[PDB]
Design a protein around this ligand. Structure first.
Ligand SMILES: [Cl-]
Length: 170
């Protein structure tokens, strides 16, 4: 199944290196511009979006009218929401870099997070554009053997559950 995964545009925390999960931060001005540049650049397929503001806004600016679904949310960082990456306890940093064995206090375990994400992908019947978050895009790419590092406001197409098709960074 062809699936376009769009990482929402820049927020102040994506810029200052602060963990951003369920905190409902808005896109920066540049983040909004990144979203606007996607309009007309992505296939006009049916759209689905995380319910968090920044994701919904990116969809809107990119010319879409997505159905809001919480399963597309970034992982919940719990007590570590907004936590500065610099001073993040080495154990969390390591776990987050390896993308495994990470369960932020009060947040979701990486296992529960990836389960709701892949469960959502399994429920899709026809190709679509998913306006989501960095951790979601990363989970998908990692499962596919490839790096899950794309920049904010960018999109990557994947033929789930097989491989990556194209990476769009404008
Ligand atoms: Cl993100």
């Amino acid at each position: 199944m062809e699936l376009w995964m769009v990482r929402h545009g820049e927020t102040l925390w994506n810029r200052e290196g602060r963990l951003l999960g369920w905190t409902d931060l808005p896109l920066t001005a540049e983040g909004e511009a990144q979203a606007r540049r996607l309009k007309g650049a992505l296939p006009s397929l049916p759209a689905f979006s995380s319910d968090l503001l920044r994701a919904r806004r990116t969809a809107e600016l990119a010319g879409f009218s997505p159905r809001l679904y919480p399963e597309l949310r970034e992982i919940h960082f719990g007590a570590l929401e907004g936590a500065l990456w610099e001073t993040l306890d080495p154990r969390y940093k390591e776990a987050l870099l390896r993308f495994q064995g990470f369960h932020p206090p009060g947040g979701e375990s990486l296992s529960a997070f990836q389960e709701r994400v892949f469960r959502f992908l399994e429920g899709l019947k026809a190709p679509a554009v998913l306006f989501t978050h960095g951790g979601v895009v990363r989970a998908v790419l990692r499962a596919l053997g490839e790096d899950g590092l794309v920049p904010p406001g960018s999109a990557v197409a994947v033929d789930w559950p097989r491989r990556v098709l194209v990476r769009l960074a404008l």
